[model samples]
Target: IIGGEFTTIENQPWFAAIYRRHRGGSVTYVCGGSLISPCWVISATHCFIDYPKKEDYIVYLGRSRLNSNTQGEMKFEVENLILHKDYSADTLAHHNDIALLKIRSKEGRCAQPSRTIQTIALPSMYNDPQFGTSCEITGFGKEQSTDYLYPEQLKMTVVKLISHRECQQPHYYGSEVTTKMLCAADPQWKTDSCQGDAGGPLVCSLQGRMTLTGIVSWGRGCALKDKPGVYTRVSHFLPWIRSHT
Candidate 1:
């Protein structure tokens, strides 16, 4: 994530690193996710829409860094990939761009919570945060869209929520931004989740709990002026998520 500093799984225990296993058995970090329950992880549908095979993805929970055999890290195989049925990958708006991963261990057990691995609480299904409310976004995304500097360790930064009206302004995303989406950005346009951060969590403190408010989805570019990062509004899809999980 641009303009963000290194973070640890200890600080963001629900963060999950998603890796794409290649043909030769080598895996590359692809997207970020959040553990919502012991067996369910939430991510972006755009990240896996083209790759329908569940065997190609691996989920690592409780890890602070990628490509390292770090202690306390637990790996799991995906038992099911549940992409939102209404998601339209071809559209720029990317409506309903969310998905759920049902994960399990080699022995068929779900994730066991620890200091470094835990579940994040979902926000109230009927409430959306107020505009300008501060939130935290965490990910292992790249520094830039064209750069190769993918952060090995997790990172985080503070961003304030942006209203849909402002986000839909002609100067910004225009009418492409929809009600199912949430927008947040640093006023200075200095920090944001870039590529590889899709499906990561944009958490906000609501009613004394860090609630999962957004799922990192898209933007014009990372940290661009007036271009807030877009996310899948989690609260808007609680019913869909409930029916699956």
Candidate 2:
């Protein structure tokens, strides 16, 4: 919700935070991700553009407040940073904008599932969710355009899906919006994922489970009217995910 309110992370257990450790002994949240399995995390390939080194990658899950200790939070070290070979950073076209990261704990094992930490199911390859369907966008990113900072608390908003036709209009992304991508906007203003929300999950309800339908990819700006945030359609990459994972 662009103009939405803050919410807890209990119901969004699959959410994960990608961070970097500075030499000053501080960790900064760089991007967001979704836990699809014990060892596999799904995120936008663009997140690697800024901090692509595997050694600099760390993941935190099950936390409500990122800057503060919430007790149930756990961190994992990334063992592999895999980006789609076709992803082009130069164009900023964000085509095939998706990636999967392999993470492990200090004990050299996969992440453990817990009450506050879990994985989100991927949508069926054949499932074609219709327009105007309800969905939730979750992120700990910026609150508004006036505020250029990504907050440490998780926030979410309910919005309807926008058809690809309307999203590709000249006023929107134009021809840049492809079948591989999806959009969620109200056509009305004041609700969207913002900066630092890059690679976060755009989950939609399916068969009583929150399924990963989209990954926060790009947008003109946060909460801008008719400029719905773009996402890497998860359903379009199932083959790629299974081949690698």
Q: TM-score, each model?
A: 0.97, 0.93
**Candidate 1: 10-residue stretch with minimal lDDT:** 86-95
Model 1 clashing residue pairs (backbone): none
Candidate 2 accuracy as lDDT:
0.83
Show the lowest summed lDDT stretch of 10 residues, model 2. Answer: 87-96
Candidate 2 lDDT for residue 144: 81
Candidate 1 structure lDDT: 0.90
In model 2, the runs with Cα more than 4 Å from the true position are 89-92
Steric clash pairs (candidate 2): 1-157, 2-191, 2-192
- Residue 198 of model 1, lDDT score: 94
